[PDB]
Amino acid sequence: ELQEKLIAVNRVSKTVKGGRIFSFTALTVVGDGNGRVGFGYGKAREVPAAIQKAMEKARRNMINVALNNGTLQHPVKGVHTGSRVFMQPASEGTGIIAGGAMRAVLEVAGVHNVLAKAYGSTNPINVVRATIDGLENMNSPEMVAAKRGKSVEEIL
Amino acid sequence: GQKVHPNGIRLGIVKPWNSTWFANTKEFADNLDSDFKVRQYLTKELAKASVSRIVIERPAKSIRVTIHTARPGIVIGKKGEDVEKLRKVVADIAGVPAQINIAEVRKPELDAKLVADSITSQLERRVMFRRAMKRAVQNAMRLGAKGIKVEVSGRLGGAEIARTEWYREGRVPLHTLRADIDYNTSEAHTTYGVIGVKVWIFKGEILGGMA
Amino acid sequence: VSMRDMLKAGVHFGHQTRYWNPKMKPFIFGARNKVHIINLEKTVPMFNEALAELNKIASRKGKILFVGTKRAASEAVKDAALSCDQFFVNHRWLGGMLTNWKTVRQSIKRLKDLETQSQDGTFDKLTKKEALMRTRELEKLENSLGGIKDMGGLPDALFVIDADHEHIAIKEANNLGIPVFAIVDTNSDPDGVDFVIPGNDDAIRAVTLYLGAVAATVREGRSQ
RNA sequence: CGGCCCCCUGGACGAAGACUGACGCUCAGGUGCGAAAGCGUGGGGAGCAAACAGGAUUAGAUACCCUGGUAGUCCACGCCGUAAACGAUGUCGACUUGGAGGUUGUGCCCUUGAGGCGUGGCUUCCGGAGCUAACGCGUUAAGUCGACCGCCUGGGGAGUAC
RNA sequence: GUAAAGCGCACGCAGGCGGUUUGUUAAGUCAGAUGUGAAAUCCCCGGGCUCAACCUGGGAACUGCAUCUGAUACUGGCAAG
Numbered sequence: 141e142l143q144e145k146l147i148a149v150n151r152v153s154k155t156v157k158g159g160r161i162f163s164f165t166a167l168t169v170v171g172d173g174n175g176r177v178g179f180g181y182g183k184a185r186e187v188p189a190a191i192q193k194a195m196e197k198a199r200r201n202m203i204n205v206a207l208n209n210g211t212l213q214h215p216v217k218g219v220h221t222g223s224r225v226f227m228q229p230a231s232e233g234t235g236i237i238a239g240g241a242m243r244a245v246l247e248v249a250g251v252h253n254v255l256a257k258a259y260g261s262t263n264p265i266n267v268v269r270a271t272i273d274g275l276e277n278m279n280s281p282e283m284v285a286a287k288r289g290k291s292v293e294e295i296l
Numbered sequence: 297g298q299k300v301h302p303n304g305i306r307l308g309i310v311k312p313w314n315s316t317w318f319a320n321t322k323e324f325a326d327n328l329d330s331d332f333k334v335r336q337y338l339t340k341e342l343a344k345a346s347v348s349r350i351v352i353e354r355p356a357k358s359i360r361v362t363i364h365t366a367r368p369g370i371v372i373g374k375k376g377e378d379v380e381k382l383r384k385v386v387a388d389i390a391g392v393p394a395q396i397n398i399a400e401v402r403k404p405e406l407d408a409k410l411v412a413d414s415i416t417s418q419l420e421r422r423v424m425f426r427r428a429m430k431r432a433v434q435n436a437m438r439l440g441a442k443g444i445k446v447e448v449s450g451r452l453g454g455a456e457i458a459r460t461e462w463y464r465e466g467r468v469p470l471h472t473l474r475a476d477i478d479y480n481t482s483e484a485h486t487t488y489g490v491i492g493v494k495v496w497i498f499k500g501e502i503l504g505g506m507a
Numbered sequence: 508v509s510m511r512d513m514l515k516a517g518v519h520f521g522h523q524t525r526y527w528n529p530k531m532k533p534f535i536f537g538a539r540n541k542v543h544i545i546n547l548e549k550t551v552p553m554f555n556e557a558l559a560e561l562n563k564i565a566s567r568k569g570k571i572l573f574v575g576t577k578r579a580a581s582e583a584v585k586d587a588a589l590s591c592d593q594f595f596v597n598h599r600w601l602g603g604m605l606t607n608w609k610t611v612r613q614s615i616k617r618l619k620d621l622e623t624q625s626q627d628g629t630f631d632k633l634t635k636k637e638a639l640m641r642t643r644e645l646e647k648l649e650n651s652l653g654g655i656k657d658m659g660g661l662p663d664a665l666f667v668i669d670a671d672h673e674h675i676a677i678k679e680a681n682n683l684g685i686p687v688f689a690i691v692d693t694n695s696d697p698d699g700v701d702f703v704i705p706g707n708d709d710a711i712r713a714v715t716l717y718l719g720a721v722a723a724t725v726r727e728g729r730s731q
Numbered sequence: 732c733g734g735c736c737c738c739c740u741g742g743a744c745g746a747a748g749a750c751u752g753a754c755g756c757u758c759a760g761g762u763g764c765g766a767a768a769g770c771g772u773g774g775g776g777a778g779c780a781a782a783c784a785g786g787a788u789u790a791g792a793u794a795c796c797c798u799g800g801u802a803g804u805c806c807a808c809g810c811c812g813u814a815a816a817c818g819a820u821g822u823c824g825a826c827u828u829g830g831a832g833g834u835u836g837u838g839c840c841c842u843u844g845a846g847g848c849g850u851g852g853c854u855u856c857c858g859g860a861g862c863u864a865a866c867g868c869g870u871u872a873a874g875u876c877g878a879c880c881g882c883c884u885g886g887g888g889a890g891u892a893c
Numbered sequence: 894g895u896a897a898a899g900c901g902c903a904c905g906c907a908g909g910c911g912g913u914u915u916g917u918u919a920a921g922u923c924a925g926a927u928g929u930g931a932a933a934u935c936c937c938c939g940g941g942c943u944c945a946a947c948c949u950g951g952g953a954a955c956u957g958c959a960u961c962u963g964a965u966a967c968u969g970g971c972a973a974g
């Protein structure tokens with residue numbers, strides 16, 4: 141029942157003495173819509189096998205995300221390479237207000253209401269890396285309670 | 297570079313001839329002429345019986361022809377009628393008492409001639425060639441073939457510039473004489489031009505010489 | 508194993524004070540003659556608690572992989588695995604051996620096919636040079652996969668000697684979640700070993716002590 | 732900034748102790764110093780050498796090469812104030828794993844030359860975390876942070892016109 | 894650093910910033926109160942044009958300013974260190 145999502149398919153090339161050969165790189169994302177999400181990036185001589193192996197890799201490396209009620213617990217700004225992502229929890233029923241890469245990652249992770257912006261490069265690979273690590277850096281209230289030796293309602 | 301004909305080089309090691317009669321130089325040529333025209337006649341007449349090879353062996357007073365088809369019931373028609381008809385026909389061509397004894401091929405997907413002509417029949421019916429060749433190789437190796445390589449050359453998809461496309465899977469060791477590599481070539485005449493297909497099917501090393 | 512049992516074998520020995528790893532400070536008794544001294548007070552209980560886990564794994568039909576590539580201790584580790592009917596790697600570790608389990612299976616099949624072919628026959632059908640070449644490939648494959656031809660599914664537990672030398676193996680294991688039991692000298696990084704035994708990994712006597720004790724407890728776990 | 736010596740003179744560092752008591756950091760304007768070439772006046776001019784003379788090569792050689800050779804190169808005093816004036820990395824302070832060196836202080840213990848424990852200054856090469864587009868940087872950061880200044884806003888036009 | 898961008902380097906006035914303790918002041922800062930911030934416009938709940946645009950009632954807001962009374966942790970001033 142893992143939701144998959146293709147988000148980028150580029151055709152790269154490499155020159156050889158006889159001719160320049162071409163390959164296709166597929167960047168896809170996968171997520172159970174319940175706080176687990178990974179991403180995959182595959183290369184193949186032709187697009188279907190590329191997306192296939194990309195989704196296969198994405199099936200591994202699925203990280204956990206400590207969301208609550210289909211939204212974040214606090215604003216997050218992940219930065220990867222030249223791309224910086226900013227995500228912020230939103231009220232109920234606002235939806236996913238984000239760029240296509242960020243929207244794919246988020247909706248496949250299961251968040252339902254969030255506001256996102258992508259500053260810097262919008263290169264989808266770096267964008268998804270940034271947002272995925274940023275999601276991995278969220279902190280649930282009970283996590284903070286644990287690492288601070290307090291009760292959760294004490295933090296609230 | 298060019299490659300030697302795989303069937304023509306393994307005749308001594310693993311491949312039997314397709315015409316095993318004997319005759320001295322006095323009537324060698326006309327034997328060849330007669331058997332050539334009779335096998336071409338049979339091919340033209342059994343273009344639907346799906347024949348793979350027509351082996352010919354001559355007793356001193358007779359001609360014996362063995363057909364290898366995937367559809368035995370077809371060539372023998374009803375109560376062996378049409379086979380007797382074409383036996384009379386080959387009797388005419390050879391001018392010699394004739395006998396026809398059909399033989400079946402159990403794995404038609406494991407016959408370079410059969411799969412090659414099937415590929416060509418598909419091409420002339422205007423189907424995307426990549427599908428054809430990859431389906432053929434998949435079927436072959438699904439039937440337990442040690443390897444298979446398909447090759448198509450010509451104006452593929454009505455291309456203005458003719459390209460060469462091949463697809464190999466398994467093991468196809470042409471250089472190893474001990475290998476049982478069945479090979480055949482077919483041609484398909486389309487509106488754009490004539491497309492050539494070649495099929496190699498390696499069915500395993502044959503340890504222990506010819507026999 | 509008792510502290511006296513280890514000390515006579517020399518388990519307290521460690522690499523020069525010039526060559527140590529930062530995380531090993533808790534396990535280090537001190538220094539003498541510019542030599543790191545390992546503390547048996549930590550070594551003995553950790554080894555016992557690891558033996559408990561190894562007995563448990565072997566008592567639930569566990570497959571155990573003894574790992575060591577030292578040219579001195581290869582035969583010791585091989586015999587150690589044979590004494591408990593367990594699989595072993597005694598020659599240079601192949602990169603991604605667990606990660607490429609599918610690739611190794613073909614090599615095992617080829618090793619099994621070559622040994623089966625020699626028993627079955629057809630070597631006479633092969634040319635004398637060809638038959639000799641097939642035997643040489645079978646011998647090379649036996650030198651490569653003598654220990655793991657009967658591995659079947661990926662192992663259930665790993666025993667590693669000199670974990671720093673075999674670091675690829677532990678990285679693979681952690682990537683697979685397979686537990687690592689390892690003798691960890693002071694120069695090693697102990698992060699990859701879930702049940703870490705800090706001790707000398709070169710000395711033949713202490714290595715044989717580790718292997719013999721582990722194998723006795725593994726046979727015990729099997730016996731039930 | 733490179734022979735040796737003398738006279739005058741600036742800074743840095745080390746050990747121990749005393750002294751003052753925030754007297755500090757940065758700095759728009761401003762002031763000064765500032766490679767080479769160049770300019771003015773006057774000396775000096777061995778070697779070298781723009782310009783120029785000549786011989787070769789070459790279509791040509793107006794260049795490279797060869798034979799010469801002036802300004803200049805040097806000194807005194809002024810002027811110029813620019814260089815890929817570069818570590819292409821502003822100054823000051825704090826903190827953060829290691830290794831091998833160079834150089835220059837200094838303490839203890841030694842039987843000492845040796846030798847071993849330390850503790851400062853500057854300097855070189857690797858490399859961890861971390862950072863970086865990458866290259867690479869990496870306790871002398873391009874890391875983690877503070878204070879202040881200078882500078883940038885697509886490429887040409889143009890560091891040009893006025 | 895190499896993409897545009899560290900003045901060639903230094904000293905230094907104005908200026909910016911400033912180690913640590915105590916006292917005082919209340920300038921900055923914070924809190925409360927009052928006055929004011931025109932109406933319209935913007936927003937919310939309603940009402941009237943057959944609906945809407947439009948008109949309209951009430952509210953909210955006008956994030957500001959000023960004065961007075963306090964607070965003294967931090968920055969500033971003063972005094973002693």
Ligand SMILES: [Mg+2]
Binds near residue numbers: 260261
């Ligand atoms: Mg951009």
Ligand SMILES: [Mg+2]
Binds near residue numbers: 299300
């Ligand atoms: Mg040839």
Ligand SMILES: [Mg+2]
């Ligand atoms: Mg005093």
Ligand SMILES: [Mg+2]
């Ligand atoms: Mg200035």
Ligand SMILES: [Mg+2]
């Ligand atoms: Mg000059």
Ligand SMILES: [Mg+2]
């Ligand atoms: Mg002059």
Ligand SMILES: [Mg+2]
């Ligand atoms: Mg003059």
Ligand SMILES: [Mg+2]
């Ligand atoms: Mg000259």
Ligand SMILES: [Mg+2]
């Ligand atoms: Mg001339």
Ligand SMILES: [Mg+2]
């Ligand atoms: Mg002078």
Ligand SMILES: [Mg+2]
């Ligand atoms: Mg300049």
Ligand SMILES: [Mg+2]
């Ligand atoms: Mg500069």
Ligand SMILES: [Mg+2]
């Ligand atoms: Mg800077």
Ligand SMILES: [Mg+2]
């Ligand atoms: Mg200054």
Ligand SMILES: [Mg+2]
Binds near residue numbers: 858869
């Ligand atoms: Mg470095």
Ligand SMILES: [Mg+2]
């Ligand atoms: Mg411009």
